[PDB]
């Protein structure tokens, strides 16, 4: 019943201020808990970064705190985040958490509600939108190359959606010029081929790209 | 600041028991956290204040603290169960939360896979545009690990390779991708492109040819 949602940018130039916003739902930030940030650099671990509390009480990392804002706005029911001076170091999956006060004598905190989770890349390089190219079939293969966008994330549907069985949406690789590709093939019955048509929906948010492109055989 | 450490890797074999360590200097004296995280998704809080469940969680989940070392303890486990786990506490003289580095669960007994291989020429469209990229994708494969190789005919090639790390399923077998990118010269001056894969000791080799 508690849901927390990350937004903001997905993307922040090196020594600017990355900014993410926080909308709690199912519960008012106003009437309890500690509400705050960890992150998650790309194959690392987990790092706490700060909370704060109705009243505008807050906490934050040591290590961040001359370079950390956290601000709450409780007519909103929402709070908020601000890193400074930021690097590719700061390049992360940002979650928001319900901070749980223990029970427990000693002060203590843990977070049992958490976001989805939202990526900022710390990068001087321009946001740049996917071209996009059908992967004709010969079941079939057919599919969708995502090719030289920046920066992550991209989504991809079939059909608008209709289409879900067998498809496999791979992991971009990162090229060595900075850029993206990524593709994404659907295993359909050969049968299907001159009396199903297949487009694969391609959206780009940083960008504002929408590719919807048909695949024919 | 205060130090959780967690060992990297622990592995079980599935129905027995896992248990997964965090140590740290009078640990017991604090209450500690558990939380479990799937590959692509946010942490669940599976354990908190050293052993008690929040709804949901089942009950071979359980946790122990005393002394200098904690211990997440998870009862015939499942291969569902494989995720990072995470200990944490607060740490009171420093008003900050800490972390452990996170244990790779790994259940044994799976099964080897070899990898599907799925590999496309480049698209008319992309020539057109005077580019060219052949696209390698490699799936369902266990254990998670595999190396590429592309050859033109016959001679091998390294130059304009990308290829992807692996990335986990959800079916607990493994997906990677590799890209070779050509002029549409190349592509038109030799018989065919080949992506071999190989997986523990196997080679599956995919080859297109200019149509």
């Known amino acids: 019943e508690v849901q927390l949602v990350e937004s903001g940018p997905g993307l922040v130039k090196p020594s600017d201020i990355l900014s993410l916003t926080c909308a709690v739902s199912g519960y008012s930030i106003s009437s309890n808990y500690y509400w705050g940030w960890i992150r998650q650099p790309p194959g690392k671990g987990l790092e706490w970064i700060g909370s704060?509390?109705?009243?505008?009480?807050?906490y934050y990392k040591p290590s961040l705190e001359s370079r950390l804002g956290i601000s709450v706005d409780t007519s909103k029911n929402q709070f908020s985040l601000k890193l400074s001076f930021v690097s590719a170091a700061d390049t992360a999956v940002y979650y928001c958490?319900?901070?749980?006060?223990?029970?427990?004598?000693?002060?203590?905190?843990?977070?049992?509600?958490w976001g989805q989770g939202t990526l900022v890349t710390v990068s001087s390089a321009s946001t740049k939108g996917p071209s996009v190219f059908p992967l004709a079939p010969s079941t079939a293969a057919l599919g969708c190359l995502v090719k030289d966008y920046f920066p992550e994330p991209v989504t991809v549907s079939w059909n608008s959606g209709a289409l879900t069985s067998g498809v496999h949406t791979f992991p971009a690789v990162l090229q060595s010029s900075g850029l993206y590709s990524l593709s994404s093939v659907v295993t359909v019955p050969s049968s299907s081929l001159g009396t199903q048509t297949y487009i694969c929906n391609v959206n780009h948010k940083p960008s504002n790209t929408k590719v919807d492109k048909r695949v024919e055989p | 600041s205060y130090v959780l450490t967690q060992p990297p890797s622990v592995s079980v074999a599935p129905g027995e028991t896992a248990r997964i360590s965090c140590g740290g200097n009078?640990?017991?004296?604090?209450?500690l956290h558990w939380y479990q995280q799937t590959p692509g998704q946010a942490p669940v809080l599976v354990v908190y204040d050293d052993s008690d469940r929040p709804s949901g969680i089942p009950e071979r989940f359980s946790g122990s603290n005393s002394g200098n070392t904690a211990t997440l303890t998870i009862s015939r486990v499942e291969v569902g169960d494989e995720a990072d786990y995470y200990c944490?506490?607060?740490?009171?003289?420093?008003?900050?939360?800490?972390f452990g580095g996170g244990t790779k669960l790994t259940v044994l007994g799976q099964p080897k896979a070899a990898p599907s291989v799925t590999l496309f020429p480049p698209s008319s469209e992309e020539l057109q545009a005077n580019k060219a990229t052949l696209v390698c994708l490699i799936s369902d494969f266990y254990p998670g690990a595999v190396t590429v190789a592309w050859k033109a005919d016959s001679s091998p090639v390294k130059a304009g390779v990308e290829t992807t790390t692996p990335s986990k399923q959800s079916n607990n077998k493994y997906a990677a991708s590799s890209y070779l990118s050509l002029t549409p010269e190349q592509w038109k001056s030799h018989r065919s492109y080949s992506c071999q894969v190989t997986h523990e000791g196997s080679t599956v080799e995919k080859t297109v040819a200019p149509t």
């Open positions: 704060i509390y109705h009243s505008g009480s807050t």
């Open positions: 958490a319900r901070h749980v006060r223990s029970g427990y004598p000693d002060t203590a905190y843990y977070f049992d509600k």
């Open positions: 009078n640990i017991g004296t604090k209450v």
């Open positions: 944490q506490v607060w740490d009171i003289s420093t008003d900050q939360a800490v």
